[PDB]
Amino acid sequence: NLDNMMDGFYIAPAFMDKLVVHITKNFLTLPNIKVPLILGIWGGKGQGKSFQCELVMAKMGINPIMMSAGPAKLIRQRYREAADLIKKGKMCCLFINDLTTQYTVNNQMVNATLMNIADNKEENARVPIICTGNDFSTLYAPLIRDGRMEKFYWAPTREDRIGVCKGIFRTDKIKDEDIVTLVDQFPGQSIDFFGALRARVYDDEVRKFVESLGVEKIGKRLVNSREGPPVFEQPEMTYEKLMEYGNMLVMEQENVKRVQLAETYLSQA
């Protein structure tokens, strides 16, 4: 089973299974089973990871105490904030986006050893910790062999990419058959590329609206009206338009690379 959709956005079944089971195991009393407190999700940037995490946690009705970079005493602060949401009978977990990093490893290690009592007097709630990153340094291996941290490698399949995109363009004109074709036309592109693609079409349509109205008339039409910020009408999103936008972003990706490579031919001055 497992219902893999939240607000029209698709969740990868295997991503969801690992995460839900992790959280569930952490909120049950098992016989003599070493339950990892931490779950490390890794793969190349731009894929689902943090976004998928947010959708699973939402589906379950969880408001997670989140962080990124962004001393190491803040981890204990956010941890206890989550442990307090549990005390008030509201399932919560600690979610750390994108992984000086020397103390955090220890801070995580001290929590993993004594999670029911983490201070910085009464004894607190156990909080599952969910971490997203790129490769996860050999720095994290002591938790891995102990069984305090479980490592999960996740890379989206063609169906995950298609699933996610249908959710991204759910509110838009486009047919699903066209969304599949667009995904197939850019197989070297991560999921955030399709999000960047949609964002640029909107950014261009707002420019057409601004150019057609005029700089001087924007203020009065947008803010003066006794109630609410106006709803912007969705642009006509054909396959060909999305395709031109897509190809344009690839050019921008390539030109940045070309420029960096071309600079090697000129002396440092």
User: From the annotation, which residues make up the binding site?
Assistant: 43-50
DSSP letter (8 states) at residue 225: S
What six digits make up the tokens of 203?
Answer: 């950014």
Question: What is the CB-side half-sphere exposure of residue 41 using CA atoms within 13 A?
Answer: 27
Residues 6+ apart with CB under 8 A from 12: 4, 48, 52, 154, 156, 157, 160, 163
Query: Can you tell me which residue has the tokens 């690839």?
Result: 250
Q: Give CA–CA dist 150/37, Å, rounded.
A: 8
Binding site for ATP: which residues?
Answer: 43-50
Q: State the number of CA atoms in the 13 A half-sphere of 133 facing the CB.
A: 15
Contact 97, 44 (CB under 8 A): no
* Residue 131 CB coordination number (10 Å): 22
User: What span, in angstroms and rounded, lies between the C-alpha atoms of 235 and 238?
Assistant: 9
